[PDB]
Design a protein around this nucleic acid. Structure first.
Ligand SMILES: [Zn+2]
Ligand SMILES: [Zn+2]
Lengths: 99, 1335
DNA sequence: TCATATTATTACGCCAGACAGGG
DNA sequence: CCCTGTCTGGCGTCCTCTCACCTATGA
RNA sequence: AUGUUUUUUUUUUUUUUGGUGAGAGG
């Protein structure tokens, strides 16, 4: 099985799972620890922001690849803003501070 | 873009500021059409239009007026994702307190209003009343009231009196709670009391009272008044395949809260009576509490069928919340997965990758390449071209592959060598071809395994895959110094068959002018691959400074050793191939090649090793047959001699001469002896079976048996497995844990019958159950370790210290187990090591000890090295580059940046699978004696007896290093003395552990002081001997009239005056303990070394109990202060022990549980770190008593003992840094001139920078005290709540952070993996240097 | 079809952490 | 009042693949 | 040498841009 780009889920902006659903590989927790074990800071940054979740990042990246410019414009993951709204939907005021 | 994440409470004004419209109706959707509800949960005006830039109902179907809201639609006009960020709010009719601040353990409202949880819930569920500023009545403010208590009060205090209930009353209490006022009171209460329990109970209440005043969190924000609703997009309502909507659980929760709130508003309209609106508000309280955190209240609500439905807190917490399932691990585009296979033609920087996966993973690069050439125009055309797969896109694909690495990943990645980057080579096929040597890194066999491929998209990621994660760059395991590209199984058989010899072959003893014609004689058919031969080889030894000097000579060698010499690079000597080359020898061949010639010859030489091993293993034809497993001819007579022996033992058992346990022990002993004899018979019969003549009489050699080369080469097989295929397969054990007395005398070449196979299945089912349940604890151990580490980044170059732990070789009592060169390899010395002669600067004080320095250490026989350890590093927030050590997979020091906490945590937890889950001293060598911790005396006979319990007996050799060590008890008969030379095997120690000696220092006469027969001691004349002994009783058997009497022996002179201790003016009286029996009676003159009484008496969960720092059930008790010791009160729960120091203050004591067999007498002076009883010892006692270096030596020795018992090589840096992360918190003792509190627990770097910026001023600092937290308590007690929330319980940590108003200055690895940016360790450390500089 | 709103099983194994009881 | 059983909560491995099954009521 | 010397309607518009549970592999 292989996946470059196709459909994703509803709640989250990450790719679907499985083969019958044309989906990508779950880059799990211990693989993130293995990339932290190296100096792979940029590989991990595209591994969890551009390739997976951030919608503006992935559309800009697809257009940047097909122009011939391997460069990522990262932004913030969508599932973290989902986390902010689920935490904030309690009596909890979680924010994002100064520039 | 943004610094720290701030968490605080949500005010009702803040919740109305989040909101966009009140969600009234609970009606979800229409359900018969497609439209929602106006205005229900899924509204239009409150949130937004379903369709993008459209009024859902009807107006604006173009792009001109985005925003207009007509009365017929009551709809906003924006994007489809606008509803995902917009949230609604439910105006709760009746106030409802939060469940996270009422049941968090400890509750936030429980230790703030000074009221028990039980009483808080009673009033909260409309079952109890609470008073609130009554007035001039006889009632308190916190005191509650019941129906009867209120009824009577109602008729009594009908006027000025307030007694409400529920959240409303609670809210008022919190609202009317002067925070500041309580502070002073609490502070004054803590300074006006001495109660230990109260002190801790008051310090925990004042801590959460002053923390609330420090932030902008109000006391009335605990109760929920304006409940917030999560965005619809985040609670999606999609239908499955069919005609119904599979609705989420949160819609059930919100719809019930809104149904109940509408009912409560209608009842407060209608003026229903009291009990109706109490049940109505109570059902609303339980509905809100079920929405927020379901199931924390009594049994959780359920929709379909009996399974409870999932609430908001269950969208956060757990293994499947947002942290562990969508933020730490994500699903990933440009990724693939398939079954692996070998492909041995590969070079070790490249892997095979199928054409179909390659054309799917590289669709955008192919699109960009196709658009560059000009073959097509629009993007559609290119997608049709690769959907059709024409003849021109495969050249495009070979031009996008070429220099573009991919990340191969095996699915259980345990350490960092399980993600490696290759270059693709395209494969006709559907299976990833993976280079074989690399398999030993992935733990990948080829029995059905699968791997995932990931594509580095951007340019920095291609460079990270080539420069950090390439497979040529990972040739040493980061856990140690051992190479991980060791040749595994076929190739060592090909080498072991190639470089060997036989006593006659084709071309025996002919002479050859080079290795080239050695291979030419092997190929043409004129010699054999193993035929001993003088060749002329030219080995290049590089003895100058970087210059290779040729020396050519004639080596008496074989043909195969010359053929393998054609592949060895220049610098290695010929003697690396002159031996037989098993697996350990080829591993040290690649290791010496890496240490001498560097990286590139070692990569190309690893490939040439693998190619020549595969080729000559193919030419070998090394099969396995049924005749290869040679049965010993002596096996049947050994079994019959064992059968005669068990027959003799059972004939004694019929006549009852021996006991049953001694029978079972004798049967297990003779079957162990017969098993060892059968193994030696088959091992001789395999290791030297070949006996071939050469030009005359016969001559023997090691065998070319196939199973023996598979065992001796170390390819696959050991002694035990080849033992079970030929000799008997031992004594298998039943699942009771005890062994079975009748062994399995049949191997596998003979047939096992039925019972023997069933006993075998006992033994093997236990092993499969152990692995399949062991793996969960191994993985959870790696998780706890990488979440306690998680932060620690090499961030300096020198901390500027002179402290470091004292690396000695470790010695258990056998031969010296782990040499000093294994422990001080590549670790930077603390002070400069003196050469063992006299005062020489052998090595300087900041040199890395690589192999050349360690060889000059081994030549001089250096005792022990004071070396720098990670736990002694002075760097605030990180570890400096010298106190870590060598890079371990790079030859140099650790770079500024490389995350060492994560590689250390992986290197400790990765061998978690291989670990298991469930008289006197006899010297061995011949050397010199030395004693430490010794205070001794010469007895009458001459044997130096010892008056100290804790004496260490070292055996030092003639060179200076310490070769043996032992522990000698109080009062033992030493055959030798101090500084003496002995012989190998001579007994040097003797004692009796069943009889605790009460030996003396001086001589004289014996008097019975406080020894009265009848109450103190008893008369027990011996039965079978007649020589009686006055038996000393204990303090429990005698009655209360004489229980105060302490029996003792004090030595006098010939007159009767007390003979004093030499050095003091005190007599030497020995107080006899309980259960003693007097050996030497009254009037008998004594000497030293003679007793005065007879006193009769682990694998992987050990690693968990060392890092998590549990206490053992019966710890060894110690002394918190030095000085004289005494006893106390007679058995009220415990038996007291009072320690009065010589110069220090007296009042320390401890109540010992009296079930322990003590070690100390009444006239004994103790010390800190000195034992009082025996058994295991908790690490907190080591930390608060001996020192920090003592507890780090304790953990690294007690866990390298597990990792060495199971045989795993791990360097000690990793355990020292997880020990650093254990003892990172501290507690204050004297607050000093700072802003801390008395017994406040604060982290160590904070208090150290505080009193280091105050001590640089005039003010003297604050004196701390370090504390050792276990790894899950230490990773949950962090100054970064996302780090402590991605890990275990999120409810406790988020309420603690919310009511404290905590802020997360990100500054670690997992905060930046959550929030989606660069890691502040690796390549991103320059980015975080830049961002930290530009503030 | 369109609002009404929650009851008659037990059978893990530590391991911390808080709580009423009593010498 | 300091030990103490006793009770309550909170953990318990990653990755993947196949299949089936989904609230009752109701004038 | 010369040409108002057989006229009649044989008619003008695009394209537009998803949970639950069970089982297997490693
Ligand atoms: Zn409209
Ligand atoms: Zn340091």
């Amino acid at each position: 099985h292989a996946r470059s780009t196709g459909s994703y889920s509803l709640v989250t902006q990450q790719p679907l799972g499985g083969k019958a659903q044309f989906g990508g590989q779950r880059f799990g927790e211990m693989e993130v620890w293995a990339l932290e074990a190296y100096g792979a800071a940029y590989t991990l940054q595209e591994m969890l922001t551009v390739k997976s979740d951030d919608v503006n990042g992935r559309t800009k990246m697809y257009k940047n690849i097909v122009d011939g410019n391997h460069q990522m414009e990262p932004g913030m993951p969508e599932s973290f803003n989902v986390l902010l709204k689920e935490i904030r939907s309690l009596g909890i005021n979680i924010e994002l501070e100064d520039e | 873009e943004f610094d720290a994440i701030k968490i605080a409470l949500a005010s009702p004004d803040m919740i109305r500021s989040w909101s966009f419209g009140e969600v009234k109706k609970p009606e979800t959707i229409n359900y018969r059409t497609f439209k929602p509800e106006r205005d229900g949960l899924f509204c239009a005006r409150i949130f937004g239009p379903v369709k993008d830039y459209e009024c859902l109902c009807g107006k604006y179907k173009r792009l001109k007026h985005r925003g207009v809201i007509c009365e017929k639609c009551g709809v906003e006009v924006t994007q489809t994702k606008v509803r995902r960020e917009r949230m609604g709010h439910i105006e709760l009719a009746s106030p409802t307190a939060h469940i996270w601040f009422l049941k968090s353990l400890p509750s936030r409202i429980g230790l703030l209003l000074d009221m028990p949880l039980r009483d808080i819930e009673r009033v909260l569920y409309f079952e109890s009343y609470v008073v609130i500023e009554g007035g001039m009545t006889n009632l308190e403010r916190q005191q509650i009231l019941t129906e009867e208590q209120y009824l009577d009060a109602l008729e009594e205090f009908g006027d000025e009196f307030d007694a409400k209930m529920g959240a409303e009353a609670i809210q008022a209490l919190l609202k009317s709670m002067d925070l500041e006022q309580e502070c002073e009171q609490l502070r004054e209460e803590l300074n006006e009391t001495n109660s230990e329990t109260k002190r801790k109970k008051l310090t925990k209440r004042i801590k959460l009272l002053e923390a609330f005043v420090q932030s902008g969190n109000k006391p009335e924000w605990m109760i929920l008044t304006v409940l917030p609703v999560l965005p619809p997009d985040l609670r999606p309502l999609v239908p499955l395949d069919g005609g119904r909507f599979a609705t989420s659980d949160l819609n059930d929760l919100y719809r019930r809260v809104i149904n109940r709130n509408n009912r409560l508003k209608r009842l407060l309209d209608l003026a229903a009576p009291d009990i109706i609106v109490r049940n109505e508000k109570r059902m609303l309280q339980e509905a809100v509490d079920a929405l927020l955190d379901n199931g924390r209240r009594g049994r959780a609500i359920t929709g379909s069928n009996k399974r409870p439905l999932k609430s908001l807190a269950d969208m956060i917490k757990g293994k499947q919340g947002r942290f562990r399932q969508n933020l730490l691990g994500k699903r990933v585009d440009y990724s693939g997965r398939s079954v692996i296979t070998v492909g041995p033609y590969l070079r070790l920087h490249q892997c095979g990758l199928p054409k179909k996966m390659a054309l799917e993973l590289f669709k955008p690069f192919i699109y960009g390449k196709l658009e560059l050439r000009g073959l097509a125009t629009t993007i559609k055309a290119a997608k049709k071209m690769v959907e059709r797969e024409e003849a021109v896109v495969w050249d495009i694909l070979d031009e996008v592959i070429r220099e573009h690495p991919v990340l191969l990943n095996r699915a259980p990645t345990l350490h960092r060598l399980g993600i490696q980057a290759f270059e693709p080579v395209l494969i006709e096929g559907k299976a990833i071809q993976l280079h074989p040597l690399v398999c030993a890194a992935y733990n990948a066999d080829f029995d059905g395994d699968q791997m995932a491929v990931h594509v580095p998209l951007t340019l920095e990621a291609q460079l990270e895959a080539r420069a950090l994660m390439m497979s040529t760059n990972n040739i040493l395991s980061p856990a140690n110094g051992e190479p991980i590209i060791v040749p595994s199984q076929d190739v060592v058989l090909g080498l072991y068959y190639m470089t060997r010899d036989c006593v006659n072959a084709k071309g025996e003893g002919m002479v050859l002018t080079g290795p080239k014609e050695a291979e030419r004689l092997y190929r043409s058919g004129l010699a054999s691959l193993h035929a001993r031969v003088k060749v002329r080889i030219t080995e290049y030894e590089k003895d100058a400074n970087g210059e290779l000097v040729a020396k050519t000579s004639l080596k008496d060698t074989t043909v195969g050793r010359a053929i393998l010499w054609m592949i060895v690079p220049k610098g290695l000597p010929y003697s690396i191939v002159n031996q037989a080359l098993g697996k350990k020898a080829i591993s040290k061949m690649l290791n010496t090649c890496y240490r001498i010639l560097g990286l590139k010859p070692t990569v190309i030489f690893a490939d040439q090793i693998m190619y020549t091993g595969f080729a000559y293993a193919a030419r070998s034809g090394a099969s396995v047959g049924i005749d290869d497993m040679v049965i010993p001819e002596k096996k049947h007579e050994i079994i019959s001699e064992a059968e005669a022996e068990v027959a003799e033992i059972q004939e004694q058992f019929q006549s009852g001469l021996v006991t049953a346990g001694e029978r079972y022990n004798k049967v297990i002993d003779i079957w162990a002896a017969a098993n060892d004899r059968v193994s030696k018979a088959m091992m001789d019969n395999l290791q030297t079976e070949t006996v071939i003549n050469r030009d005359g009489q016969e001559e023997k050699q090691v065998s070319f048996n196939s199973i023996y080369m598979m065992a001796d080469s170390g390819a696959r097989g050991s002694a035990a497995q080849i033992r079970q295929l030929a000799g008997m397969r031992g004594l298998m054990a039943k699942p009771d844990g005890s062994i079975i007395e009748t062994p399995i005398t049949a191997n596998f070449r003979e047939g096992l019958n039925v019972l023997q196979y069933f006993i075998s299945t006992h033994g093997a089912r236990k092993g499969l159950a152990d692995t399949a349940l062991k793996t969960a604890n191994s993985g959870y151990l790696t998780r706890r370790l990488v979440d306690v580490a998680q932060d620690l980044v090499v961030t300096e170059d020198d901390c500027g210290t002179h402290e470091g732990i004292m690396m000695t070789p470790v010695i258990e009592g056998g031969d010296v187990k782990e040499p000093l060169r294994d422990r001080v390899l590549g670790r930077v010395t603390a002070e400069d090591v003196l050469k063992p002669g006299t005062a020489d600067i052998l090595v300087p004080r900041n040199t890395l000890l690589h192999e050349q320095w360690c060889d000059l250490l081994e030549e001089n026989s250096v005792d022990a090295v004071k070396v720098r350890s990670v736990v002694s590093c002075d760097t605030d927030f990180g570890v400096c580059a010298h106190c870590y050590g060598r890079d371990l997979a790079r030859g140099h020091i650790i770079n500024k940046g490389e995350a060492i906490g994560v590689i250390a945590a992986q290197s400790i937890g990765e061998p978690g699978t291989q670990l298991t889950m469930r008289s006197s001293i006899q010297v061995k060598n011949k050397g010199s004696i030395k004693l430490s911790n010794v205070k001794s005396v010469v007895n009458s006979s001459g044997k130096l007896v010892i008056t100290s319990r804790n004496t260490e007996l070292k055996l030092i050799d003639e060179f200076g290093r310490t070769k043996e060590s032992y522990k000698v008890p109080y009062g033992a008969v030493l055959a030798k003395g101090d500084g003496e030379q002995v012989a190998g095997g001579e007994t040097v120690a003797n004692w009796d552990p069943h009889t605790m000696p009460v030996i003396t220092e001086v001589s004289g006469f014996v008097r019975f002081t406080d020894m009265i027969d009848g109450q103190t001691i008893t008369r027990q004349t011996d039965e079978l001997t007649g020589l009686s002994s006055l038996v000393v009783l204990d303090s429990a058997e005698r009655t209360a009239g004489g229980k105060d009497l302490r029996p003792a022996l004090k030595i006098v002179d010939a007159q009767g005056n007390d003979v004093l201790i030499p050095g003091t003016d005190m007599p030497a009286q020995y107080f006899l303990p309980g259960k003693a029996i007097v050996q030497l009676e009254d009037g008998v003159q004594i000497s030293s070394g003679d007793t005065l009484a007879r006193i009769p008496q682990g694998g992987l969960p050990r690693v968990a109990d060392l890092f998590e720092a549990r206490r053992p059930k019966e710890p060894a008790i110690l002394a918190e202060i030095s000085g004289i010791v005494s006893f106390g009160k007679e058995t009220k729960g415990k038996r007291r022990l009072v320690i009065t120091p010589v110069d220090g203050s007296d009042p320390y004591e401890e109540m010992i549980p009296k079930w322990r067999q003590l070690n100390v007498f009444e006239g004994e002076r103790v010390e800190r770190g000195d034992v009082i009883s025996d058994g295991p010892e908790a690490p907190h006692d080591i930390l608060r008593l001996r020192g920090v270096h003592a507890v780090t030596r304790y953990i690294v020795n007690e866990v390298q003992d597990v990792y060495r018992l199971q045989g795993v090589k791990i360097n000690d840096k990793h355990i020292e840094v997880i020990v650093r992360q254990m003892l990172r918190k501290a507690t204050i003792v004297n607050a000093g001139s700072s802003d801390f509190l008395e017994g406040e627990q604060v982290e160590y770097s904070r208090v150290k920078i505080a009193n280091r910026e105050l001590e640089a001023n005039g003010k003297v600092g604050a004196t701390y005290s370090r504390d050792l937290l276990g790894i899950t308590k230490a990773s949950l007690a962090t100054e970064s709540f996302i780090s402590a929330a991605s890990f275990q319980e999120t409810t406790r940590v988020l309420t603690e952070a919310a009511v404290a108003g905590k802020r997360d200055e990100l500054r670690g690895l997992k905060e930046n993996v959550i929030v989606g940016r660069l890691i502040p360790a690796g390549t991103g450390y320059a980015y975080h240097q830049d961002r930290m500089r530009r503030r």
